[PDB]
Design a protein around this ligand. Sequence first.
Ligand SMILES: N#Cc1ccc2cccc(OP(=O)(O)O)c2n1
Length: 106
Amino acid sequence: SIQAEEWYFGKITRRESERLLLNAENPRGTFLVRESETTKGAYCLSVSDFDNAKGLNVKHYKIRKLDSGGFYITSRTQFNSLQQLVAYYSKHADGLCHRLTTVCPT
Ligand SMILES: N#Cc1ccc2cccc(OP(=O)(O)O)c2n1
């Protein structure tokens, strides 16, 4: 169960995920998974990034879950679980601003 996962912050807003992630000490790829504020049955993967242009900033990717069972940010790349998705994205940047590195501190 994802609710048991330490990177699962459940019902928090986008602003709040940005408040937690916009901390000077978070390295690129700090992340958390939360509920989508407006897309039901979707989660949101909030991820911190950093570059000399934008400085420290956050990106939000919608995680869809099919009734067919798979989870995904892009339908081309599916997984049997949220946990597997997270693990995959901890190893590949793909279309993300950065590979998942560290669970957003509280
Ligand atoms: N599409 C879209 C879309 C566009 C703007 C959004 C603003 C706040 C929260 C949202 O949902 P989320 O970040 O997924 O919690 C949004 N979703």
